[PDB]
Amino acid sequence: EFGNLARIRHVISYSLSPFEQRAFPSYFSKGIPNVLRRTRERILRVAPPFVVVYLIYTWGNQEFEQSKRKNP
Amino acid sequence: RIQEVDAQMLRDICSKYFYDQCPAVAGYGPIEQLPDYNRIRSGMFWLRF
């Protein structure tokens, strides 16, 4: 509930009207580097398990296909 | 100049200067319950008008 959540002192905040400012201010020119930075920060934690299970999926499919084949 | 003011031009002038405008807000003190600017900007108009 608003008004009794925290004790804040010596903090000033400045804003604008939504009619006084652009909706998309420097969208691509500041969005492509920031998305690239977040990607650079998170690929080494996210991607390699998915790459490993991609190789597990492909290996399992080819091993199933080879076990289908009649051994001479 | 005062005597020429009736209710019709009063609400015409007030709809000119007050209705659906973007205000300037200044708060000082325990102002946590002071609403965010979108709430004041929504309070600058009525949906019943």
UniProtKB/Swiss-Prot annotation, chain A:
Residues 60-72 are mitochondrial intermembrane. Component of the ubiquinol-cytochrome c oxidoreductase, a multisubunit transmembrane complex that is part of the mitochondrial electron transport chain which drives oxidative phosphorylation. This is Cytochrome b-c1 complex subunit 8. Component of the ubiquinol-cytochrome c oxidoreductase (cytochrome b-c1 complex, complex III, CIII), a multisubunit enzyme composed of 11 subunits. The complex is composed of 3 respiratory subunits cytochrome b, cytochrome c1 and Rieske protein UQCRFS1, 2 core protein subunits UQCRC1/QCR1 and UQCRC2/QCR2, and 6 low-molecular weight protein subunits UQCRH/QCR6, UQCRB/QCR7, UQCRQ/QCR8, UQCR10/QCR9, UQCR11/QCR10 and subunit 9, the cleavage product of Rieske protein UQCRFS1. The modification Phosphoserine is found at S13. Residues 1-40 are mitochondrial matrix. GO terms for biological process: cellular respiration; cerebellar Purkinje cell layer development; hippocampus development; hypothalamus development; midbrain development; mitochondrial electron transport, ubiquinol to cytochrome c; pons development; pyramidal neuron development. Keywords: Acetylation, Electron transport, Membrane, Mitochondrion, Mitochondrion inner membrane, Phosphoprotein, Respiratory chain, Transmembrane, Transmembrane helix, Transport. Its main location: mitochondrion. GO terms for cellular component: mitochondrial inner membrane; mitochondrion; respiratory chain complex III. It comes from Mus musculus. It is a single-pass membrane protein. The modification N6-succinyllysine is found at K30. The modification N6-acetyllysine is found at K30. It holds the Pfam family UcrQ. It comes from the Eukaryota.
Curated annotation (Swiss-Prot), chain B:
Belongs to the peptidase M16 family. UQCRC1/QCR1 subfamily. It is found in: Mitochondrion inner membrane. This is Cytochrome b-c1 complex subunit 1, mitochondrial. Disruption phenotype: Results in early embryonic lethality. It comes from Mus musculus. Expressed in neurons and astrocytes of the cerebral cortex and hippocampus (at protein level). Component of the ubiquinol-cytochrome c oxidoreductase, a multisubunit transmembrane complex that is part of the mitochondrial electron transport chain which drives oxidative phosphorylation. Component of the ubiquinol-cytochrome c oxidoreductase (cytochrome b-c1 complex, complex III, CIII), a multisubunit enzyme composed of 11 subunits. The complex is composed of 3 respiratory subunits cytochrome b, cytochrome c1 and Rieske protein UQCRFS1, 2 core protein subunits UQCRC1/QCR1 and UQCRC2/QCR2, and 6 low-molecular weight protein subunits UQCRH/QCR6, UQCRB/QCR7, UQCRQ/QCR8, UQCR10/QCR9, UQCR11/QCR10 and subunit 9, the cleavage product of Rieske protein UQCRFS1. The chain holds residues 432 to 480 of 480 of the full protein.
